[PDB]
Amino acid sequence: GTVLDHLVGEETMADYLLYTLNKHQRFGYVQHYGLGSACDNVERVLKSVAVKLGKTQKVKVLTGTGNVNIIQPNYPAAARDFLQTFRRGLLGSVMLDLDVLRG
Amino acid sequence: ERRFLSPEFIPRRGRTDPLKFQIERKDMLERRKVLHIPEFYVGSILRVTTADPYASGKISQFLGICIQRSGRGLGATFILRNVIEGQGVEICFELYNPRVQEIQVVKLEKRLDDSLLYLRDALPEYSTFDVNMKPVVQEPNQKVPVNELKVKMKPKPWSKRWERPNFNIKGIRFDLCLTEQQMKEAQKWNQPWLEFDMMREYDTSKIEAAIWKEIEASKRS
Amino acid sequence: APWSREAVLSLYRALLRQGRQLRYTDRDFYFASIRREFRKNQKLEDAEARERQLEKGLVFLNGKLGRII
Amino acid sequence: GNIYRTEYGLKVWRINTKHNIIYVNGSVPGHKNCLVKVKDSKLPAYKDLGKNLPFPTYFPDGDEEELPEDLYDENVCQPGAPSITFA
Amino acid sequence: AIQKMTRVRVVDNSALGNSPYHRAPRCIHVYKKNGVGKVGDQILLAIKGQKKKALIVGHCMPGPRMTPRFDSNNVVLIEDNGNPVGTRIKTPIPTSLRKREGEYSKVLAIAQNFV
Amino acid sequence: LTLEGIQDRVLYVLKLYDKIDPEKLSVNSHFMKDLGLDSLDQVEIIMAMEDEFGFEIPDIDAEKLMCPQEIVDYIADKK
Amino acid sequence: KFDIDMMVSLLRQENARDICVIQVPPEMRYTDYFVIVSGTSTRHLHAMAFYVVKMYKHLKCKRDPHVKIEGKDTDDWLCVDFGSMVIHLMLPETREIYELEKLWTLRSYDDQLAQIAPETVPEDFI
Ligand SMILES: *P(=O)(O)OCC(C)(C)[C@@H](O)C(=O)NCCC(=O)NCCSC(=O)CCCCCCCCC
Ligand SMILES: [Mg+2]
Numbered sequence: 001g002t003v004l005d006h007l008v009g010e011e012t013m014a015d016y017l018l019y020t021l022n023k024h025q026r027f028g029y030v031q032h033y034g035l036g037s038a039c040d041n042v043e044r045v046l047k048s049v050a051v052k053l054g055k056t057q058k059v060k061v062l063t064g065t066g067n068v069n070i071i072q073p074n075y076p077a078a079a080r081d082f083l084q085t086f087r088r089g090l091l092g093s094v095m096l097d098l099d100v101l102r103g
Numbered sequence: 104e105r106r107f108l109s110p111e112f113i114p115r116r117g118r119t120d121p122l123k124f125q126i127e128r129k130d131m132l133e134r135r136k137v138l139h140i141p142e143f144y145v146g147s148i149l150r151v152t153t154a155d156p157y158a159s160g161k162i163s164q165f166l167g168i169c170i171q172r173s174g175r176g177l178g179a180t181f182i183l184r185n186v187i188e189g190q191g192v193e194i195c196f197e198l199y200n201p202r203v204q205e206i207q208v209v210k211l212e213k214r215l216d217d218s219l220l221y222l223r224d225a226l227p228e229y230s231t232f233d234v235n236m237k238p239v240v241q242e243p244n245q246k247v248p249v250n251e252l253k254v255k256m257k258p259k260p261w262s263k264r265w266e267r268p269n270f271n272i273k274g275i276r277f278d279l280c281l282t283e284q285q286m287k288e289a290q291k292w293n294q295p296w297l298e299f300d301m302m303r304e305y306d307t308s309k310i311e312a313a314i315w316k317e318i319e320a321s322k323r324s
Numbered sequence: 325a326p327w328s329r330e331a332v333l334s335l336y337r338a339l340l341r342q343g344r345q346l347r348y349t350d351r352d353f354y355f356a357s358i359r360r361e362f363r364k365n366q367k368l369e370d371a372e373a374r375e376r377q378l379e380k381g382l383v384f385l386n387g388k389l390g391r392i393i
Numbered sequence: 394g395n396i397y398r399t400e401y402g403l404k405v406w407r408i409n410t411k412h413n414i415i416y417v418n419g420s421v422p423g424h425k426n427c428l429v430k431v432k433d434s435k436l437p438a439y440k441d442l443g444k445n446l447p448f449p450t451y452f453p454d455g456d457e458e459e460l461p462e463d464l465y466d467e468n469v470c471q472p473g474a475p476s477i478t479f480a
Numbered sequence: 481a482i483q484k485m486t487r488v489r490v491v492d493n494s495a496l497g498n499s500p501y502h503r504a505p506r507c508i509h510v511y512k513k514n515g516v517g518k519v520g521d522q523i524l525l526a527i528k529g530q531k532k533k534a535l536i537v538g539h540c541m542p543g544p545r546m547t548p549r550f551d552s553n554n555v556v557l558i559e560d561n562g563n564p565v566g567t568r569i570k571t572p573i574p575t576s577l578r579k580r581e582g583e584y585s586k587v588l589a590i591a592q593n594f595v
Numbered sequence: 596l597t598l599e600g601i602q603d604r605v606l607y608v609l610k611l612y613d614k615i616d617p618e619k620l621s622v623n624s625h626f627m628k629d630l631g632l633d634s635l636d637q638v639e640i641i642m643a644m645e646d647e648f649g650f651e652i653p654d655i656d657a658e659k660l661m662c663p664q665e666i667v668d669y670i671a672d673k674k
Numbered sequence: 675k676f677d678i679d680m681m682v683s684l685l686r687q688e689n690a691r692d693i694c695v696i697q698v699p700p701e702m703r704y705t706d707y708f709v710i711v712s713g714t715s716t717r718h719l720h721a722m723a724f725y726v727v728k729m730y731k732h733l734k735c736k737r738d739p740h741v742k743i744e745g746k747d748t749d750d751w752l753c754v755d756f757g758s759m760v761i762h763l764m765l766p767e768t769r770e771i772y773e774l775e776k777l778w779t780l781r782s783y784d785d786q787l788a789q790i791a792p793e794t795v796p797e798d799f800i
Binding site for chain 5: 157180189190192194223
Binding site for chain 4: 118119120122126130133134136137138154155156159160199201202203204
């Protein structure tokens, strides 16, 4: 949280923080969000989070027939909540410099 | 006994010298006798064969539904729209461009609206047509069929506010896409005095007769 | 699994008939390309995709969309 | 507006002999049915090009032959000509 | 037609161009003096946190006569030197890239449909 | 023609092959187990000999050749 | 006369491996003959590229416009497009990555073309 999350994109560190949790094998998000099992697909994890909290957003998608407004799970809202939960500490202790410490 | 005149032969209202129109029509009749231009309206299915200048003059084909017949003079044009592979395309062909090899009316039909520009916001299958569909036969001495199809529209927003009275569209199921309050709100732009404004109607009856005399005189010569 | 085994071998040698009649391209690469193409598309066990490979092989023999000479 | 302006480097694609009409390339200043003064181009690259042009002018009465109805350009495709097929 | 901060549709089968969130990349720079992109011009895309150059093949803005008009703005990704990122093109593309001066034979070879 | 000149040409064009191992080359060389040849391999070697020895052999019989003895037999009685 | 017969012969002395010539039907609206050439090193394709264009300019055809080399900065891929013949000089590793032979013989029947998913028009959620 030392820098603003919006200028990097909430999706890129949602996967990165998910990546670090898998590396530490903590899997604290599995029971927190009621997920079936640990997963690595970032989009599918955010889909479950949006499903869990009932967050939906309508977006414009570029199709071959033109622009279509469809309602989709609110991935940015899911990413922001998922990032906030980790920062609050509900996902357990983390260490981002373990790899550089070992060499 | 039904006779049909191509829309571009009737000049727009203005101060242009009629002598220019006479010379423009002479070029049309000289060009028309070489390349036959079949009669068609907006909504008909047209297959146009042209030559691509930068592909070694290879023969080109394109099939689509006519949605607009605008322009006047030798610059008259029509727009064919089709969805190929799932992506919609539009081409504004030129009637008198010598690049055109032949024009074939696959299906001659009329729609409830003069212009089909609202098909862009309509559902994709209302504009998708088979590229190699077999042309259907037209019975001689038969009235031009009129299609009463009311297309279904994609959710708002649209490219243009088709429900407003100025567009005057009668080929859209508005009740399946717009609520009653939205229709009433669009009614505020209605102008009931336009239809009764006698000074803005263009009387072409005296003009079409002159055009027909010129057309038949050239053919006899 | 395919339409018929005899058709598959019949088209394979039919391709070699065309390859023997070719003039411009390289016979060594043409022979090598067709054999390795068959080596990977077989032993699929799906019994339906191999039928799709049959029809695309059939149009290759006809060469109405593209002919290599 | 309402001032005199001149456009340079306009070529003649077609000439109609019967109606005395010149087909100049591009647009010209002035509205419709306005009187425009026309003369030979003064551009340096277009000097010494009146060798074959009529001098001092064309005299149809004294001409030995009758001009065609329309004088076209070599690059201009005639309306009656068959449709162009590119090479 | 296409300028800075304009969403575009990627047509080739490049893995980069496939968005799992259905999010369309937007152009951040147009490689022209006036900053306006017509069919066949080269632009820059900021896609998935990467600044990848792209080539535009179709736009919704109308063009000259007898030129096909697409209802969506289509782009194809290319490398920093000219090679395409994706392997093949599925959506139809204009044939005007032959006449235009530039590196268009690579995309035309991998293209499938002509309109 | 000479009957001897048939068999020696048949085995020579078989020895020209690279992937297969010329371990046992008799008139009864069964390719399924000795050489491990599939339908494609058995078809291809027929083209490997037809190009230099043949031009009158269709598919209706080439699918059931199975041994070098009978191309000698099939060539001999065809001529 | 500059045609495929001389084009293939001009490519023989350049040690051009895996020469492929495909007759393109007029319905494809691209060209008449499509040529694929494999090389060994980046200098080799450049050597072939300069050799073919030098003969093309020198030999005949003053009327038609000149041809520029396409892909000079691209080391792996290089191409040159004449009036009716186009050649794509690329490394064999690029040939496997960019498979071009089947696409110009099978239209929309290619393995990769059959691999891609069709238009879906994403639907609404719940
Ligand atoms: P044999 O009887 O032992 O063979 C039986 C085998 C092959 C083992 C079958 O059981 C099998 O595994 N597959 C049967 C056929 C199959 O799987 N696919 C059909 C092949 S058709 C094909 O590949 C299309 C050919 C197109 C040619 C393209 C070449 C391009 C060169 C430039
Ligand atoms: Mg708009």
